Coordinates of C-alpha atoms (C1' of nucleotides) in Angstrom, one line a residue:
Chain W
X208 CA -8.6 -27.0 -162.4
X209 CA -6.2 -30.1 -162.5
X210 CA -7.8 -31.2 -165.8
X211 CA -9.0 -27.8 -167.1
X212 CA -5.5 -26.3 -167.8
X213 CA -3.3 -28.5 -170.1
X214 CA -4.9 -27.6 -173.4
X215 CA -7.4 -25.1 -171.9
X216 CA -4.4 -22.6 -171.4
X217 CA -2.6 -23.4 -174.7
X218 CA -5.5 -21.4 -176.3
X219 CA -2.5 -18.9 -176.3
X220 CA -1.8 -20.6 -179.7
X221 CA -4.8 -18.4 -180.8
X222 CA -3.4 -15.0 -179.5
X223 CA 0.0 -14.8 -181.2
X224 CA -0.6 -13.7 -184.9
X225 CA -0.4 -10.1 -183.4
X226 CA 3.3 -10.7 -182.3
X227 CA 5.4 -13.7 -183.4
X228 CA 5.9 -13.4 -187.2
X229 CA 2.7 -11.5 -188.1
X230 CA 3.4 -12.4 -191.8
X231 CA 5.8 -14.9 -193.6
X232 CA 9.3 -14.1 -192.3
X233 CA 10.6 -16.6 -189.6
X234 CA 14.2 -15.5 -189.0
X235 CA 17.4 -17.3 -187.7
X236 CA 17.3 -17.0 -183.9
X237 CA 17.3 -19.9 -181.4
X238 CA 15.1 -21.5 -178.6
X239 CA 18.1 -22.2 -176.3
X240 CA 17.2 -25.0 -173.9
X241 CA 17.3 -26.7 -170.4
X242 CA 18.5 -30.4 -170.3
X243 CA 19.1 -32.5 -167.0
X244 CA 19.3 -36.2 -168.3
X245 CA 18.4 -39.9 -167.4
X246 CA 18.3 -41.4 -164.7
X247 CA 19.2 -38.5 -162.3
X248 CA 17.5 -38.7 -158.8
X249 CA 16.0 -35.2 -159.4
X250 CA 14.1 -36.2 -162.7
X251 CA 10.2 -35.8 -162.8
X252 CA 7.7 -38.7 -162.2
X253 CA 6.9 -38.4 -165.9
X254 CA 10.3 -40.3 -166.5
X255 CA 8.5 -43.5 -165.6
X256 CA 6.1 -43.2 -168.6
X257 CA 2.5 -42.5 -167.7
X258 CA -1.2 -42.6 -168.8
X259 CA -3.1 -39.3 -169.6
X260 CA -3.7 -36.7 -166.7
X261 CA -2.3 -39.3 -164.2
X262 CA 0.9 -37.1 -164.7
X263 CA -0.9 -33.9 -163.5
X264 CA -2.8 -35.4 -160.5
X265 CA 0.3 -37.4 -159.2
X266 CA 2.7 -34.3 -159.3
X267 CA -0.1 -32.3 -157.6
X268 CA 0.8 -34.2 -154.3
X269 CA 4.3 -32.4 -154.6
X270 CA 5.7 -35.9 -155.3
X271 CA 6.8 -34.3 -158.6
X272 CA 10.1 -36.4 -158.8
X273 CA 11.2 -40.1 -158.9
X274 CA 13.7 -39.7 -156.0
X275 CA 11.0 -40.0 -153.2
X276 CA 8.6 -42.3 -155.1
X277 CA 11.0 -45.0 -153.8
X278 CA 9.1 -44.7 -150.4
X279 CA 5.6 -45.6 -151.9
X280 CA 5.5 -49.4 -151.1
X281 CA 2.1 -51.3 -151.4
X282 CA 1.2 -50.7 -147.7
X283 CA 0.7 -46.9 -147.6
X284 CA 1.1 -45.9 -151.4
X285 CA -2.2 -43.9 -151.7
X286 CA -2.0 -40.3 -150.4
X287 CA -2.2 -38.6 -153.8
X288 CA -5.3 -37.1 -155.6
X289 CA -7.3 -39.2 -158.2
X290 CA -4.7 -41.6 -159.9
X291 CA -7.3 -44.3 -160.0
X292 CA -6.5 -47.1 -162.6
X293 CA -4.0 -48.1 -165.4
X294 CA -1.2 -45.9 -164.0
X295 CA -1.8 -47.4 -160.5
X296 CA -2.1 -51.1 -161.7
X297 CA 1.3 -52.6 -163.0
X298 CA 3.8 -49.7 -163.9
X299 CA 5.7 -50.8 -160.6
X300 CA 7.7 -53.5 -162.6
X301 CA 8.8 -51.1 -165.5
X302 CA 9.8 -48.7 -162.6
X303 CA 12.4 -51.5 -162.0
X304 CA 13.6 -51.3 -165.8
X305 CA 14.9 -47.7 -165.6
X306 CA 16.0 -49.3 -162.3
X307 CA 14.1 -48.2 -159.1
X308 CA 12.4 -50.5 -156.4
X309 CA 10.0 -50.8 -153.4
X310 CA 9.9 -53.1 -150.3
Chain Z
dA1 C1' -18.1 40.9 -79.4
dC2 C1' -18.1 38.8 -83.3
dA3 C1' -20.1 37.1 -87.8
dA4 C1' -20.5 36.9 -92.8
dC5 C1' -22.4 39.6 -96.0
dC6 C1' -22.8 43.8 -99.9
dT7 C1' -19.6 45.4 -103.4
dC8 C1' -16.0 45.4 -107.2
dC9 C1' -10.2 44.9 -104.9
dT10 C1' -6.1 42.0 -106.9
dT11 C1' -4.0 38.0 -106.8
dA12 C1' -2.7 33.8 -109.8
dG13 C1' -3.6 28.8 -111.1
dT14 C1' -4.1 26.2 -115.3
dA15 C1' -4.3 26.1 -121.0
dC16 C1' -4.9 18.3 -125.0
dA17 C1' -1.8 15.1 -128.7
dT18 C1' 1.7 12.6 -132.3
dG19 C1' 5.7 14.0 -135.7
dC20 C1' 9.4 16.3 -139.1
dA21 C1' 12.6 20.1 -140.5
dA22 C1' 17.4 23.6 -138.8
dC23 C1' 21.8 26.6 -138.3
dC24 C1' 24.4 27.7 -133.4
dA25 C1' 26.0 34.0 -132.9
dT26 C1' 26.2 38.4 -128.9
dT27 C1' 29.4 41.4 -124.8
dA28 C1' 34.1 44.1 -123.3
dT29 C1' 36.6 44.5 -119.3
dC30 C1' 43.2 49.0 -119.0
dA31 C1' 45.4 42.8 -116.5
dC32 C1' 48.0 46.2 -116.6
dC33 C1' 53.8 44.4 -115.4
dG34 C1' 56.4 43.5 -111.7
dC35 C1' 58.9 39.4 -109.8
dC36 C1' 61.2 34.8 -110.3
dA37 C1' 60.3 30.2 -110.7
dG38 C1' 62.5 25.5 -111.1
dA39 C1' 62.5 26.5 -115.8
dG40 C1' 63.7 27.7 -120.5
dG41 C1' 67.7 27.5 -123.2
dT42 C1' 72.0 25.1 -124.8
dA43 C1' 76.6 23.8 -124.0
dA44 C1' 79.3 19.8 -123.2
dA45 C1' 78.7 13.9 -122.1
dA46 C1' 75.5 10.7 -120.7
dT47 C1' 71.9 6.9 -123.2
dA48 C1' 74.8 5.2 -126.6
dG49 C1' 73.7 6.8 -132.4
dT50 C1' 73.8 8.5 -136.8
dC51 C1' 74.6 7.3 -142.0
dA52 C1' 78.5 7.8 -145.0
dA53 C1' 82.3 5.3 -146.4
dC54 C1' 83.8 0.9 -148.6
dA55 C1' 82.7 -3.0 -148.6
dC56 C1' 79.3 -6.6 -148.4
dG57 C1' 75.5 -9.6 -150.3
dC58 C1' 71.0 -10.5 -151.9
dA59 C1' 66.2 -10.0 -154.0
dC60 C1' 63.5 -8.9 -157.3
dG61 C1' 61.9 -8.0 -161.7
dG62 C1' 62.2 -7.9 -166.7
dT63 C1' 63.7 -9.8 -170.6
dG64 C1' 63.8 -14.0 -172.8
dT65 C1' 62.2 -18.8 -173.8
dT66 C1' 59.4 -22.3 -172.8
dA67 C1' 55.0 -24.5 -171.5
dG68 C1' 50.2 -25.6 -171.8
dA69 C1' 46.0 -24.0 -171.7
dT70 C1' 42.1 -22.2 -173.7
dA71 C1' 38.9 -20.7 -177.2
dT72 C1' 38.3 -21.4 -181.2
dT73 C1' 37.1 -24.4 -185.0
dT74 C1' 35.0 -28.7 -186.4
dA75 C1' 31.5 -32.5 -185.9
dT76 C1' 29.3 -35.5 -183.5
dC77 C1' 25.4 -36.8 -180.3
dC78 C1' 21.0 -36.5 -177.5
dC79 C1' 17.1 -34.3 -175.8
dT80 C1' 13.8 -31.9 -177.3
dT81 C1' 10.0 -30.2 -180.2
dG82 C1' 5.5 -30.3 -182.2
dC83 C1' 1.8 -33.0 -184.0
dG84 C1' -0.9 -37.0 -183.7
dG85 C1' -3.4 -41.3 -182.2
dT86 C1' -6.2 -42.5 -179.0
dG87 C1' -5.3 -42.8 -174.1
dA88 C1' -8.7 -45.0 -168.1
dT89 C1' -8.7 -40.0 -167.0
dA90 C1' -12.5 -37.0 -164.1
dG91 C1' -15.6 -38.6 -161.2
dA92 C1' -20.4 -41.0 -161.2
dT93 C1' -21.6 -44.9 -160.0
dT94 C1' -21.4 -49.7 -158.2

DNA sequence: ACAACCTCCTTAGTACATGCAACCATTATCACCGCCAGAGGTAAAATAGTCAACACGCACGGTGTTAGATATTTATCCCTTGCGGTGATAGATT
């Protein structure tokens, strides 16, 4: 269920002809949003730029946010689900380009 | 000599458990009315004071002007959307 969600649920894009402009009449009304900005200590782990469902199976450890990823030094790093290859390999130096670090 | 036994005698000891809703009456009955207490009343003076007078003196509030803030307008910027290209996932195996 950590794979079988992220387009498996957006099948909702096939249930909406009944309700959200049934015809040909998109009207002026907004989407009215949610912003919280770079590089705030609250921002999600996705704000390190990732590699397919690596994003899902990392945030599933409740390490959803960059602020505590700073603890994950190459001595005890693995506690997470899956997260097995390109993600895990070398991103640790571009982590230091938005500006974080380990030690 | 007493013993309990036959009969219907009467006595009287009890009657399971949990909970919620409602409001608090009926009596008549001379208390007499006489006396006098300290004890109610109030006049005149203690324990002390009112508020009107003429002064005193101040605060507050509303009218006026000023200040600056705010909500508008404008326009800029970024973060987000949705699709797409193609990503190393998920997890089966080494």
